[PDB]
RNA sequence: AUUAAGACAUUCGUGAGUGAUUUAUUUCCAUGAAGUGGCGU
């Protein structure tokens, strides 16, 4: 996680997932001037193959037709996404509002075998959604 | 504020109903209430 300016994150006991699933945080501050994306890609370096793109985190593309046109083979799978949408001042005591649209992402471990060249085209299509990239989606090696 | 929060695998339920420790088996087999006279020559 990257926190801007004055923001302290203390280790505590947290809730993550349904049925009040309980977890323990350990907050460790790594050295400064570091890029977390570069750290994740360094971790994923050992799975790199130059003839294909490896999907490491759930990847979303608005239209799969262009992606399929850009590669010869899509040895891929699909996962489901639906977010609980809450405003900054919401009820928080009641049935939460969920995303009215159910979204399909590319499963991690999927591989895209692009044509000759055009790797930059697929990469540009994937990184066109920078909001998802910041959150942790659409990460590849 | 995170496909989230709330939710006892719980309620009712006799290990109970029928059942003879009974049937078959001679306290029986063998066995002498018997033995001997004595003295007075």
From TrEMBL:
Protein name: CRISPR-associated protein Cmr3
Residues of the full protein shown: 239 to 379 of 379
Domain of life: Bacteria
